[PDB]
Amino acid sequence: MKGDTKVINYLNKLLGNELVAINQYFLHARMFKNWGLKRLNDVEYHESIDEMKHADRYIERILFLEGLPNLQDLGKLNIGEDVEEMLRSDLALELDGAKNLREAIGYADSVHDFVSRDMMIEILRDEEGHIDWLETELDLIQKMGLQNYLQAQIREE
Amino acid sequence: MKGDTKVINYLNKLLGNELVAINQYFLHARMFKNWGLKRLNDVEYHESIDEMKHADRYIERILFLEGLPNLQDLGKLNIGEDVEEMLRSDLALELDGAKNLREAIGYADSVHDFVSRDMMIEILRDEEGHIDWLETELDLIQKMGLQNYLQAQIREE
Amino acid sequence: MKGDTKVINYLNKLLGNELVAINQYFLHARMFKNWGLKRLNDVEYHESIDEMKHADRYIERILFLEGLPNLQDLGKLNIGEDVEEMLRSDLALELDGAKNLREAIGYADSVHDFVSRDMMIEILRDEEGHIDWLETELDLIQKMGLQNYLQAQIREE
Amino acid sequence: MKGDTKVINYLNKLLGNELVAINQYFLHARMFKNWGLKRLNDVEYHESIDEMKHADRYIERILFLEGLPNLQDLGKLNIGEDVEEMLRSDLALELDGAKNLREAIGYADSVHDFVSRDMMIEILRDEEGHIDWLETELDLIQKMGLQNYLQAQIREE
Amino acid sequence: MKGDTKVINYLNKLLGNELVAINQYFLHARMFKNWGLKRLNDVEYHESIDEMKHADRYIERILFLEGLPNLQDLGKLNIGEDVEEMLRSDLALELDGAKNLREAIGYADSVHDFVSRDMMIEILRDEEGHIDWLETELDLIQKMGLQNYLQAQIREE
Amino acid sequence: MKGDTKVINYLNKLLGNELVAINQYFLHARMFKNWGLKRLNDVEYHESIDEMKHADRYIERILFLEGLPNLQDLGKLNIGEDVEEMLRSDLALELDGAKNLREAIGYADSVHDFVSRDMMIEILRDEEGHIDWLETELDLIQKMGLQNYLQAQIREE
Amino acid sequence: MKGDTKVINYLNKLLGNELVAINQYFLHARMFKNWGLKRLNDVEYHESIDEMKHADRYIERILFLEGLPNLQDLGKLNIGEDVEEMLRSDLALELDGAKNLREAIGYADSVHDFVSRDMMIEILRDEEGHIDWLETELDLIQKMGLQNYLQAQIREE
């Protein structure tokens, strides 16, 4: 079913955000795993999987709308080198992605693509959950100090 | 069964104490939850539920005694802005309510309302348990230091 | 994640509506229970629980958006003295709350807070369910007469 | 297998009767449901389903006999505005349908389409069951009075 | 609860679209069944059921809003005489109905009937799924040729 | 119980038809089995079994009515040499048998042997099902072509 | 444990190959899904998952060897526009990756990194399995023709 060209463009932009996050979350997860921070490996791995599900949804929606999903272009990752930098980079990426989502959701409504909008709102709700988790972890690092924080990650939850 | 007017007045005062505590414990729980202090969310949530049960018992008793339960007036909440402050506020509220319970229990005895007294004694035993828990947590904050204390709250027990 | 100030104000207003309804439904339920109208006790109790869930969602959303939930102010309850008067008062409260919800949902869309909007639409759906139930009960009182209506409430369903 | 032209015509006429009854029973059920008359929603819904099964049998028989099922033409519904009026309308429709069935059953026999006749006799037996139920309910409204009758419908049976 | 008159008119228009589709899908299903195309009978039958569910939701919503559901008027069926023709007709009907849904969804938003809107968005998501299925089947007829396509339908999947 | 002589004569004629069909269906089944067309073996074998059941019913009915079942005379088989020929021959036999059944059913009614008639109507319903199956397969051969049709028979259904 | 710099460089090159294949296989899978070719969706999806597992192994190995996994650079995808083109492109990518694996396996042996080598040989065995599958499907398209081939993909295996 032929979709709106700019809706497809938004879907590809958001798909692009998801592809960066999939890789960044996954690399962070395995960095945490290497360092023995099992709990952070588990959560970040889960976040990567969640972004994969989102990417899949964008891909299928774009195809249904008769557009071409773009998995070729990959945006900039910012890996970081310590736990705080890594989590802050994931947070910055989530915030940029949420801004893109809000713009796309408003636009989809205006051209009456209510199903694409509904999909995007569910994904945005997911992203805000990730934002909440990242903000909370960053605050905990400050509240309990980095040494206690790292200790609290070595066992799975 | 027409009850003693002053007993009903005490039950409404105690109901009022419970209504403040229900809201204060519940808000504290969700603040703790927001901050990632899962253990404190769990305990404060269950304390809110306990106070709800007490409130229900007062409402039912007042209605049996043919009085009018007052759920309209709400006493002063003191939320606090950090963990120690919030727990100290909960403890102060518990102590104030225990003072009112002791008065009411003595009075109900003087007018031979032994069933209302029996109900309030069970509720007071409940509140002294909350007092014990709050006192103990506050002591632990001082003994292990705030950073260790916060770390100990992030996993459910 | 810092939310829009007016959205947070709306959420607090709606939270306020839920807080009135929680108490009014709960007192109505126990009044019905006292009178032996078991069926009405069961329904109104479950409606009170439903509004508690809504209140919880508002409290959590407000805290996420870095606002301060207001559980201190409690709006006007209208208890009523007979079954029809009590149900009419619950209906009036539901209808006032639905108006507030519609205004907030429109505004959340305007400022692109689609996740707060999604939450409120779910809550509004729940509220219209309560309205449906209340309207239906009030019509039944008129159609079968009060004596038959009361007889119909003494067994749990 | 090429069927008799007038047998196919009768089947389409009967199918036409069932199509009206499907919609009228269904709308009646949901009207009853809206009014809180659960027992009447349940019965009328099941009657709508029964007529759907009959419609299915006619459609399949017409196609087997190489005719064209007519689902385009819809005869007159008579909804009515109160319980007695609605049930009387359903009864009138059943009685007209039964007349048509009797005529078709005699004709099918005359042209030796004994399998179409056998199908129609089973359907007619079903319809007379509905007529029995409707007559019984209408008599009950008169014997116990409308207020008692409505009270008897609020719980599923 | 007295609804918006124009929302009710849209709900009746959409209900009308559903009623045509219910009949058209069901007849197509049984035509496929008669031809031995079991897979196509199964899918089209379930699409008919899906449209019945949508019709039910519209009927219940309209009654809640104190309108009168129109099951009397039935729009034009376009049955068709061969598999491709039939599937194309179902697709054309889906596309017309989606256009009506988009219009109604936009309007309900303007009058703040967000629950009616939410219901219609879910139904639109369902219809776009049917559109996807129909488009895909039509393309398959072209890609594998009609003889292979028909062979692929004779066993249930 | 002494039956009507001409009813018994009809029952023997019908039994005769069944006896030819039992053999023709069984041989067809095993020819298809030899050819590797497992699906056709399965169905035709089942049809032979069905005709055995019918023959058993006629034999038992004739004996109850104090007549002599005739299993000695066997009418003409037309085996055919390819799938289409074989299926057409089964269809022609079914059609001839159905005309005989119709005559016998009308006659039984005229002499008030309603039990023999009832038995024959059930059997006729069964034969029309075989007719529907054969007509459908023959059409499928034409629509998908013989090569696809044969391919579709090699696996069991 | 500090690894050999050129081994890490090989591991990143191989990881790079896997990253292209993950995306190319996944997009191919969802294109096939959109087209109704369920069998090809299932297999290609599985191949994408397999390449994710390989990528995970490289990432973990690189980190153990104290290098930096490169998930930022993504090589050229060649999506293609029809089934044969898409499959040939997957085959070409697999063949390019296998040549890289062979080079890396020989090199790892020369610097005595036998564990990295062992990991890569297992992965190469997996890729040759994908190569066998793709070569086989491409031959089948030719042997049975595209129309039969597409028909064979519409059901899950």
Residue numbers in the entry:
A (entry chain F), B (entry chain C), C (entry chain D), D (entry chain A), E (entry chain B), F (entry chain E), ...: 1 to 157
Quote the paper.
The capacity of cells to store iron in a bioavailable and safe form is a central feature of the strategy nature has evolved to overcome the dual problem of poor bioavailability of iron and the potential of the free metal to catalyze the formation of reactive radical species. Bacterioferritins (BFRs) constitute a distinct sub-family of ferritins, found only in bacteria, which contain a markedly different diiron ferroxidase site. Unlike in other ferritins, the oxidized di-Fe3+ site of Escherichia coli bacterioferritin (EcBFR) is stable and therefore does not function as a conduit for the transfer of Fe3+ into the storage cavity, but instead acts as a true catalytic cofactor that cycles its oxidation state while driving Fe2+ oxidation in the cavity.
We sought to determine whether these aromatic residues are involved in coupling electron transfer to oxidation of Fe2+. Rates for the five other Tyr/Trp variants were 70 % (W35F, Y10F, Y107F), 75 % (Y114F) and 85 % (Y149F) that of wild type BFR. X-ray crystal structures were determined for the Y45F, Y114F, and Y149F variants. These, along with previously reported structures of W35F and W133F BFRs and Y25F and Y58F BFR subunit dimers, showed that the substitutions did not cause any significant changes beyond the substituted side chain. EPR studies of the EcBFR variants revealed that Tyr25 is the site of radical formation; only in Y25F was the Tyr radical not observed.
